[model samples]
Target: RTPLMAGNWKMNLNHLEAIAHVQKLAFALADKDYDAVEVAVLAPFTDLRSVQTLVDGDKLKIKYGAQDISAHDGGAYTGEISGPMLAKLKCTYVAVGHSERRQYHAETDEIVNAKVKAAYKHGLTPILCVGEELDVREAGNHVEHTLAQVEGGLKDLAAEQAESVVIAYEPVWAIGTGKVCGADDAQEVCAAIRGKLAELYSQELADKVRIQYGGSVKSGNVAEIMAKPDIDGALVGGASLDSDEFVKIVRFRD
Candidate 1:
């Protein structure tokens, strides 16, 4: 599987700033870098045009996408951005049901499922985010809860489409709190997700689908995290804001 180091900008960077940031990053990474690892930026809806322009105009190797997309194709959903619009902007990926959205926006599994379907319909790859709360982990239900979310989120996605998508396990409690699961804990759950994919789809598809671990990811911890056989890459948050720090993360193997 190709390791994808994706930076989720998460409401940071205005359109102009986004252009400057991508320009700096593109200069930092050489063409050889793209051959080694896949790099992507998940920007806010407002910055897509700027990101697209910078990436395409400079012929940068980095791939960029949107943070979210509406589950419906088109409708008067007021304030909602549809998958087709994102696709039209050449968005290669979309994050579905991030923990914040699930908690604050009441994004249920049903809604996440629809969003996943919509992304696939628009030919955009969906990155399904799933993880357990601290209490759920303490209760030993983390694996079951996460697997259920994975199963439910990808419900109805064809095997071919599922293989092209990504899954990120971001334990909600660990996010932005400086608390991080050790490499072992991350691998165990990631392995479980891969196993679930194998059972639901096939071994070939499971092997091809990339799984990521997010929450407290930084340059210091990235190597150890990426060393795991099952942990394909990272979904970075705070560390991704600084172009220098994020560039270091993208070139972690160095």
Candidate 2:
């Protein structure tokens, strides 16, 4: 399986800055980089159009997607971005149920599931996010909590869709806290996530799905995390804002 090192750009960078940023990434990434890893950037809604224009014009191998996708196709919702809109932008992926969204916007698992279906319907892959918070982790129920989220977000999803979906296991406690989950611990959850997928769909289908680790990922620690067997790649946060830093993350083996 090709490891996908995706940058979750979050709410930073305007359109022009986004163009420049992506351009820097495109220039730094070589054939070998593209061949070994699938590099993707999850950009903010406002930057999607400009990033699309630059990517399409340059025919860059780097994939781009939206940070969030609306569960509805098109509707009276005033401030929501629909899956159809993201598809129109030629997005190859869309993040569903990111922790920030769940924390701030109160998006539940049911809503995440709806968005997941919406993304598949519009031919966009959903990078489904699942993890436990500090409280849950402290309680030593992280696996059960995260697995419940996995089941809920993927409830009723077809095998074909499940096979292509990317699951990001980001421990909320570790995010932006300078606390990284040890490699073995991260793998423990990731392995369990894969096993859950196997139970949900099948081993064959689960094997095809890429599972990623996120939260406080940087070039310094990325290599060890990537070394884990069940970890396919990372969904990076702050470090992704810097083109050079992000490139180093993409080349973690080196």
Candidate 3:
């Protein structure tokens, strides 16, 4: 499977800023980079349109997606972006249950599961986020706690959907705190995630599903993390905001 380097913009860039940032990223990446690694950006709802236009009009190879999707397909869910809307915009992926969403917006695993189903309904892949917090890690229950989130988030999903899903293990304690979970530490949980997938579905399915590591990922350290067998890619945060640094991450093998 190709490595997916997805940037989770997380409400930082506006529509105008998004174009400039994406353009910078486009300028930096080439055919070699695109062929070696799959590059994507999960932009805010407001910026998706601009991103769509830029990618479509320019015919850029950089894939673009949304940060979230509405659990409900459509209705009176005001301020919520539906899966159909994102699909209509040609989004290839969406983050379901990011730590920030669970922390700030009070999204539960049940809600995350609904969102995951919704994404598949409208022909979009989901990057399901799951992990433990600082206290949970301190208690030495990181694997159990994180596995529960994965099980909960993926409830009732079919094998096909599960195979295409990208699971990101983002320890809450490391996100945006400038603290990176060590490569070995990150690998332990990531491999556990793959094992859980095998248990839930099958080893073949588990091997097909791409698992990513998030939380404070930067070019300087991305190489070490990417070296892990289970960590197929990164769901980058702050470091992604810098196009140059992000380019380095995309070309981590170099």
Candidate 4:
């Protein structure tokens, strides 16, 4: 699987700031070694156009995406962005069922499934985020809970669609809490996720699906985390906002 370093900008940058930030990032890594690593940024809906413009206009190797997409295809969903809208803007990816959205917006597995399908319908890849909360982990049901989430999220996806998407395993307790999971702990779960995929799909498909780890990822600890066999890449949060720090993460092997 190709390593994908995706930054979840969250609700951080506005359109104008996003343009500047992306521009700096593009310039910083302009001549760096990117053939081994795939870099992407998940900007807020309001800032996707700005990101798309910069990446497309400059013809930079940098890739861009969105934080979320509405499950509904179209109609009066009030304040919602559909898959078609995202595809129209040349969005390369869409994050489905992030922990924050699951907790704050009460997004369930069913809704996430619809969102995943919607992304495929629009010809955009869906990066499904799955993990367990502190209590769930304490109960030793992390694997089961996570697998169930994966199954629910990708329920009706075609084999090709499933193979094309990405899955990020982010333990909810560790996000922004300075409690990074040990490398072994991360690999154990990541491997389990891949094994589950193999059971549901084929070994080739399982091997082709890229799995990422997120939560409290920083330049200081990125190498250790990325060293794990199953950790294909990262879904960075706070660290991704800093141009210099994030650049270091993109070049962690150096």
TM-score of each candidate?
Answer: 0.97, 0.98, 0.97, 0.97
Candidate 1, residues 38-153: lDDT per residue as tens digits? 89999999999889887878788899988888999999899999988998889898999899899899999999999999999999998899998878887889999999999999
Over 4 Å off, model 4? 176-178
**Mind giving the per-residue lDDT tens digits that candidate 2 earns over 97-136?**
9999999999999999999999999999999999998889
**Worst lDDT window (10 residues) for model 4?**
173-182
- Per-residue lDDT of model 3, residues 24-95, tens digit only: 999888999999899999999999999999999999999999899999989998899998899989999999
Q: lDDT per prediction? A: 0.89, 0.92, 0.92, 0.89
Candidate 1 clashing pairs? none
| Consecutive 10-residue window with the lowest summed lDDT within model 1 | 171-180
> For model 4, how does the per-residue alpha-carbon lDDT over 87-116 read when each residue is reduced to its tens digit?
989999999999999999999999999999
On a 0 to 1 TM-score scale, where does candidate 4 land against the true structure? Answer: 0.97
lDDT winner, 1 or 3: 3
Please give the lDDT score for candidate 4.
0.89
Over 4 Å off in model 2, which ranges?
176-179
